[PDB]
Symmetry: none
Subunit: 223 residues, 4 copies
């Protein structure tokens, strides 16, 4: 099931059990302390989406679309994005307000390359896994680095938010707030997990965190 | 070549050099200690197959078909609903099994609804930390999973014949045939197996390259490269 | 058994076979080179404890209690505000320490506000790449962190007595007691430790299975399995 | 020291102990089997440089400059548009090359638009699983990539001279100079290299610490620590 963790967040990302970040409705930024009794520290800045990777990589975008990378507070990286996901230093993707899709090049002076397609959310994993959903709710998995010249393969179902920590840990929520996890069977690809969430973050190590419409925060209790 | 390790085991699984478990003919459970002078510690419980992952995840099944996950606390094991005969854990997120009728199952991550059936028929399976999955059927035919890579037939047949298989990562795949001959994957599907000297009935191939096996008389071996 | 490695060190930390660091009695800092013929290179600075992670992260504290993180450039170290006496780095995201009054701290990832106090009292701590954390208190009592797993008491006591502890991953946990006796975790909380021949005063257990130690006379050892 | 391994190779790359590939003077391709008694299996195709990652990713270039990625199925290789002379694969997401005019390229993850030029001029490059990238230029000057860390000049020069370099992770960086002398990085940019006994013309340094090399007469060696 799910365990409630005190606090309020509107978007959340989990790269690993030790790297979990979110933003609240007001755009305040928080990182998970590892202490469930005192679970958040506020990190200076303002963001509306955030992507936290297994290796400690953290990227975010603000309401205007400005893009930032955490420097271990924030360095702006040129461009404009509306949603962002970071699975690792080398696998960072986002989408802009118009739905265009970009992947980070690793060159801060020329930081994005556009990837053909249209998406409204995206999840990028440490292992290179990339999944997305479009405005209508259609679901895609990236194949453009695997020889597919149409880049994306549609996977049945409908989701509004998605997160991929690894090939084997992919979760999303539909517009109704129903929660799904990928089965690993493209012909029968989702299994419903009880609960209601509006955003979700799935880590490479299996950790899964989510927030519901009211801002309540949950960690999946797999044991 | 192989280094002989003291003790007696019937099935074995290796996820990493620090997470290697086995079961003996009496169904006792043992974990490798890291010291070849005192290699095994008995973990309470009874199992007939076991899967141990690099991330620490350990799953097992017993003679009745009951399914267990190790909980790393003083309760030791939790029973997960269902019935399985063989099991393999590549990681927390990549756990597969085969039931007594040869049906194939993948763990869903929901203990309340824990398995989805994956099409096919197998007799042994090996799952890895990177999502890699290989299986063998009762006639010895060998398959690698493709159902998460857009293949509507779920599995691709790889030439050869094996009776047990293990695949802790895409790059470390090993099996044995019914005659106890040992093979490792070349990574070339058109020339897929290299014979390795020795004799084993079960094998465990870790994500980190460790390889452990057991032979028909209970003898235990670890692979030595240097 | 242990292989003796030349040189002299007082404390040691191993994150992986390629990231092993120590300090000597003079507070000089050394990094393992990967060649047992010329095993140490002195890194400029002065420290009394050090934590080295598999991901390359290295943290240290000096005799004054000052806290440093290695920056992997010609500046070498950056001072992080606060005071600590012992430190362990499992990864960039999992760094813990204990101060001179036994209070426990976890790194927040914000150098401007770097520590949160975790309830408890300890004298040594070992943090891993998977989030695993073990500690010991001054009476030798042993604890494993549970405060990120819903436990309002933050730690579970594990039977036994140790004075130094290291835990680079859930599956590779080692310690020494005040008499210099060496123990490794069995993974069974009801039968938790296996004695290992040898004698050490500090130990470092890597994510990849590497294990290094130092003895009371400064002697340095690496664990050999094969 | 080095262990000699049978066979003959001209260039080599090691991503992990289980993913090591090379090419010989005839441009034949070989993969390491894991058994030093029968160490190589020829993989069909022709290449002049190769990069093999810990995650299984393998890229290569041929004498014409054509670029290939291994597809782990019976087709073996897929050609990727462009021309390169040297290549290194740290992981699926971190692949770099140098073309015959010394221009530097990073893989974009889009086979239809596969390369972005990174400013600079190099003659060899080594990329790691953690994003680490090192290069050398034709005069032997050594650089480490900083262009993803806010540096508008993209590279920092590290003292010394090398002709081939490999960097499977931040903590395992090795090279050779034009005189075939072997060096490993100390992690101290002000005292950056340790000389290692032996003689090699190419080297591959894995994410897991494995190190392989080849010498001018085709001789193949693996580094042994214990
Ligand atoms: C993460 O939850 C936040 C919440 O969003 C509020 O900002 C509140 C004032 O602070 C809590 Se953290 C105690
Ligand atoms: C990440 O937070 C940003 C914020 O969104 C504003 O752009 C502000 C002007 O700069 C801060 Se960076 C401290
Ligand atoms: C990622 O930022 C994008 C931005 O969203 C615009 O599409 C702009 C036309 O292109 C930049 Se990338 C130069
Ligand atoms: C991922 O982008 C999708 C897009 O959202 C549309 O569904 C379009 C019809 O197909 C593309 Se896939 C090139
Ligand atoms: C993930 O897609 C879901 C979809 O959102 C609907 O809830 C539908 C009723 O079930 C599908 Se899963 C067959
Ligand atoms: C994660 O789903 C939550 C849901 O959002 C509601 O808060 C409900 C009251 O509790 C469930 Se937890 C089964
Ligand atoms: C692992 O080998 C075991 C063996 O299976 C027997 O249980 C025997 C009683 O003890 C040996 Se060593 C623990
Ligand atoms: C793993 O061992 C199992 C055992 O096989 C029995 O099913 C017993 C009922 O439960 C133990 Se675990 C309490
Ligand atoms: C994995 O367990 C299977 C079991 O073997 C049976 O096929 C049963 C009909 O379905 C269950 Se799925 C809980
Ligand atoms: C893996 O399952 C195999 C099965 O063993 C049979 O060979 C059957 C003819 O093919 C299925 Se693949 C759908
Ligand atoms: C792995 O398959 C083996 C098979 O089991 C037989 O030993 C056969 C003689 O050789 C094949 Se490898 C061509
Ligand atoms: C690591 O051992 C050191 C030792 O601590 C002394 O600094 C000595 C001067 O040199 C030996 Se070897 C570098
Ligand atoms: C790690 O070494 C430290 C040292 O202990 C001193 O505190 C000195 C003030 O700073 C050096 Se790093 C400049
Ligand atoms: C980690 O440093 C601690 C320090 O030891 C003191 O307890 C001080 C009162 O609080 C600081 Se937290 C910056
Ligand atoms: C880890 O801290 C321990 C402490 O050392 C004491 O044993 C105390 C009685 O228990 C606390 Se656990 C809240
Ligand atoms: C790790 O704990 C040790 C302890 O330090 C003593 O050596 C005691 C005699 O044995 C216990 Se292990 C039962
Ligand atoms: C890897 O070494 C090879 C060598 O390059 C030659 O192709 C030779 C014909 O066979 C040796 Se061993 C496969
Ligand atoms: C990797 O080998 C290549 C080879 O070099 C040739 O370019 C040929 C045209 O293609 C083979 Se792969 C079909
Ligand atoms: C990597 O290939 C390069 C190539 O070497 C040339 O510089 C060409 C002008 O640009 C291509 Se980028 C497809
Ligand atoms: C890596 O490229 C180097 C290049 O080799 C030259 O040394 C040039 C003077 O500096 C560039 Se760094 C912009
Ligand atoms: C790696 O750089 C080497 C260089 O190649 C020369 O061997 C020189 C004599 O020594 C430097 Se290391 C100071
Ligand atoms: Mg997201
Ligand atoms: Mg098995
Ligand atoms: Mg320590
Ligand atoms: Mg190379």
């Amino acid at each position: 099931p799910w365990k409630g963790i005190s606090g309020s967040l509107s978007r959340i990302s989990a790269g690993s059990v030790t790297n979990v970040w979110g933003v609240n409705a007001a755009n305040n930024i928080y990182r998970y302390t590892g202490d469930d009794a005192k679970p958040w520290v506020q990190i200076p800045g303002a963001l509306t989406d955030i992507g936290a990777a297994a290796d400690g990589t953290v990227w975010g975008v603000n309401a205007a679309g400005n893009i930032y990378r955490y420097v271990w507070h924030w360095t702006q990286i040129k461009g404009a994005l509306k949603r962002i996901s970071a699975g690792s230093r080398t696998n960072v993707w986002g989408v802009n307000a118009g739905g265009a899709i970009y992947r980070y090049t690793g060159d801060d002076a020329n930081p994005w390359v556009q990837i053909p397609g249209v998406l409204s959310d995206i999840g990028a994993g440490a292992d290179g896994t990339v999944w997305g959903v479009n405005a209508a709710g259609e679901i895609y998995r990236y194949t453009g680095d695997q020889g597919d010249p149409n880049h994306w393969v549609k996977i049945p179902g409908a989701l509004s938010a998605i997160s991929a920590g690894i090939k084997t840990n992919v979760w999303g929520v539909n517009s109704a707030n129903n929660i799904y996890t990928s089965t690993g069977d493209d012909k029968n690809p989702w299994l419903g997990i009880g609960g209601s969430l509006v955003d979700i973050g799935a880590g490479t190590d299996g950790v899964v965190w989510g927030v519901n419409a009211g801002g309540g925060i949950y960690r999946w209790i797999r044991d």
